[PDB]
Amino acid sequence: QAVQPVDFRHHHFSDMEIFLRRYANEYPSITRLYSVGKSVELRELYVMEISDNPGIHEAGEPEFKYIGNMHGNEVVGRELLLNLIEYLCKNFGTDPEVTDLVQSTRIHIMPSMNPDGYEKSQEGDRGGTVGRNNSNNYDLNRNFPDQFFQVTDPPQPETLAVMSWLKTYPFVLSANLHGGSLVVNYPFDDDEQGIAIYSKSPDDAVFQQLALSYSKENKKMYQGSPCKDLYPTEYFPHGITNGAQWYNVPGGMQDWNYLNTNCFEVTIELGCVKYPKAEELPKYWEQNRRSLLQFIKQVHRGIWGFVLDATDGRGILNATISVADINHPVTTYKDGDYWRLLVQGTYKVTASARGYDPVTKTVEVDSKGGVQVNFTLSRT
Amino acid sequence: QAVQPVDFRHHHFSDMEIFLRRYANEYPSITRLYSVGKSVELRELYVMEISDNPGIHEAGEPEFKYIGNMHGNEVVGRELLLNLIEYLCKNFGTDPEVTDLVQSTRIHIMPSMNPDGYEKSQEGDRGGTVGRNNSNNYDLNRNFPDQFFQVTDPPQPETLAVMSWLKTYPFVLSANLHGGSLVVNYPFDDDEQGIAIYSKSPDDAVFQQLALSYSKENKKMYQGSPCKDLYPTEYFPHGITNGAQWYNVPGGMQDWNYLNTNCFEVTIELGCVKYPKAEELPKYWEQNRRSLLQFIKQVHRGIWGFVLDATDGRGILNATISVADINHPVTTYKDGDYWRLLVQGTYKVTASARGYDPVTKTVEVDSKGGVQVNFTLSRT
Amino acid sequence: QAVQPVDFRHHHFSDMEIFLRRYANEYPSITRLYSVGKSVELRELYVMEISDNPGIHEAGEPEFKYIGNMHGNEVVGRELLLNLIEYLCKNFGTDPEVTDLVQSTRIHIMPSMNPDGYEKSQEGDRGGTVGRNNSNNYDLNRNFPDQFFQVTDPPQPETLAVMSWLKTYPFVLSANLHGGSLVVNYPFDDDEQGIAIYSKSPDDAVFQQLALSYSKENKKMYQGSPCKDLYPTEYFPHGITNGAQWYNVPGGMQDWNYLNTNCFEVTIELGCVKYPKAEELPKYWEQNRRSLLQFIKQVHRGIWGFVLDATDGRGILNATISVADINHPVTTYKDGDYWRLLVQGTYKVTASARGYDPVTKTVEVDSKGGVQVNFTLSRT
Ligand SMILES: *[C@@H]1O[C@H](CO)[C@@H](O[C@@H]2O[C@H](CO)[C@@H](O[C@@H]3O[C@H](CO)[C@@H](O)[C@H](O)[C@@H]3O)[C@H](O)[C@H]2NC(C)=O)[C@H](O)[C@H]1NC(C)=O
Ligand SMILES: *[C@@H]1O[C@H](CO)[C@@H](O[C@@H]2O[C@H](CO)[C@@H](O[C@@H]3O[C@H](CO)[C@@H](O)[C@H](O)[C@@H]3O)[C@H](O)[C@H]2NC(C)=O)[C@H](O)[C@H]1NC(C)=O
Numbered sequence A, B, C: 001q002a003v004q005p006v007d008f009r010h011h012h013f014s015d016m017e018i019f020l021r022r023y024a025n026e027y028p029s030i031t032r033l034y035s036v037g038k039s040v041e042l043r044e045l046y047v048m049e050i051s052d053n054p055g056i057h058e059a060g061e062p063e064f065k066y067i068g069n070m071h072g073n074e075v076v077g078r079e080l081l082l083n084l085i086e087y088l089c090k091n092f093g094t095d096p097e098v099t100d101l102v103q104s105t106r107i108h109i110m111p112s113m114n115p116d117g118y119e120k121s122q123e124g125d126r127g128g129t130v131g132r133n134n135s136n137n138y139d140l141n142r143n144f145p146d147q148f149f150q151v152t153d154p155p156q157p158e159t160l161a162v163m164s165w166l167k168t169y170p171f172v173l174s175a176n177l178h179g180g181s182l183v184v185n186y187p188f189d190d191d192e193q194g195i196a197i198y199s200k201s202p203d204d205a206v207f208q209q210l211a212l213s214y215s216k217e218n219k220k221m222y223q224g225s226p227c228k229d230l231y232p233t234e235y236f237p238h239g240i241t242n243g244a245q246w247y248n249v250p251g252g253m254q255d256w257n258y259l260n261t262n263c264f265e266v267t268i269e270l271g272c273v274k275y276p277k278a279e280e281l282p283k284y285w286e287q288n289r290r291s292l293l294q295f296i297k298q299v300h301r302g303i304w305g306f307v308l309d310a311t312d313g314r315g316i317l318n319a320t321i322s323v324a325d326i327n328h329p330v331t332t333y334k335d336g337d338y339w340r341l342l343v344q345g346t347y348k349v350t351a352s353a354r355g356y357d358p359v360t361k362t363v364e365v366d367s368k369g370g371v372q373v374n375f376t377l378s379r380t
């Protein structure tokens, strides 16, 4: 019933700009196209906001983001996100699922974090590196401040642009896309020793759930074998892998998110062939569409609510939501709204807050959707 | 009574940008300035929307567009459209005619489709070609997919940008401007044989009416003699000419419009001197002002209405409006609104529609304005 | 109580763009970021509008503007204005003063009028000139049409961009920032003889008041000695100086404002060290914060009101407000609103107007705020 995309082709900057603007103009009521800075070579770092209320963060509405093409020659991501912009804009109103999604979530899509790199890439490139780095030749996914290793590559404009952006909005869930393998990689990406060993995050459980939500839907990925004849040593049970255990990555964007914002991000490898021929494109969409969809929905699971100031009766800003035995607290936005991803199980959440008295409620998250929980705090 | 323009000078990109932004800022309630892509040399392809409801297509409100400077060295167009942006913004509210126009129509003006070309042009150039082509040196008016000849020049960014744009909005009437002659040229621009012979379009009659509406108002053009001492072989009865009969043009933007959208476009040659000296500029405006005005009004003539779904009671999207013996159907927008240009005479319109049962009403279009006609269709 | 800035560092274009966009996005309800053109090297000439009604000029709401970094290597301004954008956005709502300001005034901030120049500058530069001029090497502050000397340097894009901008909005008060000295310089900047002599403007009194409002608050400036060991010949009583008397400046932007718009502009020299090391930055903010604040408030002092057409009962556009014995009339905006800066004293204002009969009321401006005065004019 829902309308599938049709524009299945590699989109160079010029056309991606065109494509993007066409949708920004054709559905002005659902979209908001903006830039977040400029690549070294001055190419806009475009993002397509898709909400039934473009431009504004409404209270209790979770903010989600997808990022693709961080590595210039890893193209599948870029195209899939365009396919998505289309699919979403086209089915909004007509299709129940899409309409529901665009209404309940504020989706932000950036098809290419490294557009300069893309332009220097070669179609057909399977495992190469030409165009991977940015214009100054640094790995944008080694360019972020790492928690263990101390990054040395100078901060690149695409990096800075994006860091700022991650601070600008209350991003809850996110996924940045790649190519070179088929698996959804989760935190941590590295370890104190800098070796390929499992490096567990406080939120290990949730992450496994998140990664699986996507991999479960991409059939060949779920199988665990990315490409038996190329990289025959790779085997990922159910298509997900802790980053560090696969191989140590210091300076990545994935862990930065987690460690410096409330956002929880996963790295998705869409296939061993980095830059496949344009003909394969539609197949990549058919294989990831349900995945991309199912993944976004996860932004709703867990717990959410507001931290209301008992005397005003209104939201407190930057209150802290702490959970049972998970050492990764979460903060609240301007309307005191908060979102905390968790797995089915019973927890003990505590709303902390400067100048207020902490409250602790026992909450019960189950298999399905998210539970709403409000914390009213008195002063001192 | 109405206020005439004053900024009579050649505007290079920098200043055209400035000029444009000044009006976008001074009259934010009537204007919306946007880009549609970037020239090869990264210059924005600006468009100025002028509606009393900038940014939105309201149902039953016809969408109109003027495009100029496709050929870099053909400057008169560029300037006239700027003069127009001014004239419109300045008289809105004060002047009855302008106010009426901006309210009833959603006008889109693009002063330069080929800004790179412009910059390489020489003032005073009368028949030359320096700056005509785009930055990669292709004739943007030979760059479109032709119905007879099969175009070979690679698609240029300015072309692609514009094609996309023609798809983005429900353009009803349009006119792209030129220099090198004095006549309004209409479809078709070429023929199966690729020779200078009359090549009739299904809408030949309407086109002649449209072309005349403009030429009738430009005195010297209406006379039929563009410039007796330069190109003395040219004689256009009443200042209009079928394109192909004047000379075969394959790949033009004019015919593309017609054949791929609902938009009906005419090519207007504003004078034999492509790049006249800035001093002549005001005279060109005085001679075309009434023309530019009268032409836009044509967007209202003929027939228009909605294709309402009988069970919902609301507009059907992409229904087809077919006319008596004219083989060039028209589609409806998102609110099921449609606009069909026709000449005074009696027709038999049929609203076709997938999943619905066709209706056929006999309509009567007369000398003056347009007739409103709604088609309510039942399902199956 | 109010929140101070934290981002204390030199911001190159890339980061300034990022910084700016972050605030445009984080506080969309209070801000509106736009460009006014592009530097020679195509860098946007950004401006941050900060009003509780971004994008619209509401009637009777005074329009204010701050401009910095006209001279590439004079950096303090650029940074302070960024600090300000922050400070304002961050305290709006929380802080009473800021909230009041953003509500009553439409503030426009341009951190860098000469971004190309900036990029070619050297941190630590104290009195040098590298990066002062624009990309084509002209002094943007000698590039404006002068009232005495006749400017020869070709008009630069940054100049043109800004001139247009000064025409686009009803700017009432303004201040462009500099480095190389510590004093607030006021009109006129030059004289018929082109020498360093006092060149008095019709509004001399008001200007002295305006300049002092700022200098009084910057302690070391108020002292009158900019930097005793560098430029030991400089002594400015109370930190303000008539421009021309300090030294003849023909072609400046400061006097242009006055002479071609209603805007009254002052030139502020923030310190002898043009490009100090990033470490000093916070100190510069601590020393100018109250100044920048107090200065903006001056936009409210004097007299203001509307020129209502007696028969319509609505505002007349471009009426003239003439004062007692001050030869510098003022015009009204679209809602017939006007703002006239004056000093405590008694005046005799006359509302002139084409097609109407002049009225003259005796008004009394005092020490504190501004007085509202409306002029209803009959026709003829
Ligand atoms: C893409 O950019 C990345 C940087 O973000 C480049 O990776 C860097 O490559 C250099 C060159 O080998 C590495 O430095 C070398 O390290 C060895 C081992 O310690 C040392 O012996 C050498 O003297 C030199 O310092 C650097 O570690 C590495 N950085 C990262 C984060 O991997 C990469 O080369 C670029 N890719 C291409 C194709 O140019
Ligand atoms: C501006 O760009 C247009 C292309 O859009 C250029 O026109 C093209 O010019 C070439 C050169 O003559 C033509 O190709 C030649 O055709 C002849 C005749 O068949 C053939 O014998 C030659 O071997 C060659 O292929 C081409 O047909 C023509 N295309 C069009 C659409 O007219 C034009 O040259 C450019 N103008 C300038 C001043 O550079």
Ligand SMILES: *[C@@H]1O[C@H](CO)[C@@H](O[C@@H]2O[C@H](CO)[C@@H](O[C@@H]3O[C@H](CO)[C@@H](O)[C@H](O)[C@@H]3O)[C@H](O)[C@H]2NC(C)=O)[C@H](O)[C@H]1NC(C)=O
Binding pocket: C129, C133, C137, C138, C139, C140, C142, C143, C153
């Ligand atoms: C920055 O740009 C300004 C122009 O806006 C440059 O100032 C100009 O410098 C030239 C060179 O000396 C001056 O012209 C000379 O004037 C003398 C004296 O009359 C004459 O004898 C020479 O033949 C020559 O014409 C010009 O007056 C001056 N303009 C202004 C407004 O000061 C300046 O040089 C540039 N700065 C740097 C570091 O390049």
Ligand SMILES: *[C@H]1O[C@H](CO)[C@@H](O[C@@H]2O[C@H](CO)[C@@H](O[C@H]3O[C@H](CO)[C@@H](O)[C@H](O)[C@@H]3O)[C@H](O)[C@H]2NC(C)=O)[C@H](O)[C@H]1NC(C)=O
Binding pocket: A305, A306, A308, A372, A373, A374
């Ligand atoms: C916990 O705190 C939340 C913060 O307000 C609160 O949200 C508020 O919920 C109420 C009731 O659902 C909404 O009521 C508004 O809309 C209804 C109509 O739908 C009107 O009848 C009301 O007068 C009112 O306008 C609020 O819109 C919503 N937010 C605010 C700011 O009021 C949660 O509902 C609270 N409860 C729980 C269990 O979490």
Ligand SMILES: *[C@H]1O[C@H](CO)[C@@H](O[C@@H]2O[C@H](CO)[C@@H](O[C@H]3O[C@H](CO)[C@@H](O)[C@H](O)[C@@H]3O)[C@H](O)[C@H]2NC(C)=O)[C@H](O)[C@H]1NC(C)=O
Binding pocket: B305, B306, B308, B372, B373, B374
């Ligand atoms: C054919 O179908 C058109 C599609 O609706 C229809 O347009 C609608 O016309 C009605 C009546 O003119 C308008 O009525 C609205 O505004 C009036 C006040 O001006 C109110 O009293 C009504 O309650 C209503 O809100 C509609 O705005 C207009 N469009 C829609 C969506 O209703 C044509 O009028 C129809 N008739 C013909 C002869 O073509």
Ligand SMILES: *[C@H]1O[C@H](CO)[C@@H](O[C@@H]2O[C@H](CO)[C@@H](O[C@H]3O[C@H](CO)[C@@H](O)[C@H](O)[C@@H]3O)[C@H](O)[C@H]2NC(C)=O)[C@H](O)[C@H]1NC(C)=O
Binding pocket: C305, C306, C308, C372, C373, C374
């Ligand atoms: C001189 O002329 C000014 C131009 O109108 C005038 O401004 C108008 O002032 C009135 C009264 O303060 C305002 O009244 C509006 O708002 C109140 C509620 O706050 C309503 O009760 C009224 O019905 C009305 O909607 C106007 O908003 C304001 N502007 C306009 C266009 O009406 C000055 O007040 C006049 N008087 C003086 C002494 O200058």
Ligand SMILES: *[C@@H]1O[C@H](CO)[C@@H](O[C@@H]2O[C@H](CO)[C@@H](O)[C@H](O)[C@H]2NC(C)=O)[C@H](O)[C@H]1NC(C)=O
Binding pocket: A318, A320, A331
């Ligand atoms: C939000 O909350 C934090 C703490 O709840 C506020 O104070 C510090 O913020 C930093 C942010 O990096 C934390 O690392 C510290 O733990 C917090 N406490 C102290 C003593 O510094 C912070 O000011 C608030 N704002 C932001 C943006 O975090």
Ligand SMILES: *[C@@H]1O[C@H](CO)[C@@H](O[C@@H]2O[C@H](CO)[C@@H](O)[C@H](O)[C@H]2NC(C)=O)[C@H](O)[C@H]1NC(C)=O
Binding pocket: B318, B320, B331
């Ligand atoms: C709108 O209508 C057309 C036909 O009414 C829909 O289907 C085809 O659209 C193409 C468009 O190029 C036409 O050439 C065909 O004649 C139509 N029929 C068939 C069997 O293909 C079309 O899907 C609708 N949407 C658009 C954008 O045209």
Ligand SMILES: *[C@@H]1O[C@H](CO)[C@@H](O[C@@H]2O[C@H](CO)[C@@H](O)[C@H](O)[C@H]2NC(C)=O)[C@H](O)[C@H]1NC(C)=O
Binding pocket: C318, C320, C331
């Ligand atoms: C606004 O008012 C002026 C005069 O009140 C109008 O007419 C002339 O405007 C110029 C503007 O440069 C003044 O120098 C003249 O003194 C005015 N009078 C004459 C006889 O020219 C002007 O048209 C109006 N509009 C603007 C933009 O100024």
Ligand SMILES: [Zn+2]
Binding pocket: A071, A074, A178, A179, A180
């Ligand atoms: Zn990768």
Ligand SMILES: [Zn+2]
Binding pocket: B071, B074, B178, B179, B180
């Ligand atoms: Zn032409």
Ligand SMILES: [Zn+2]
Binding pocket: C071, C074, C178, C179, C180
């Ligand atoms: Zn200076």
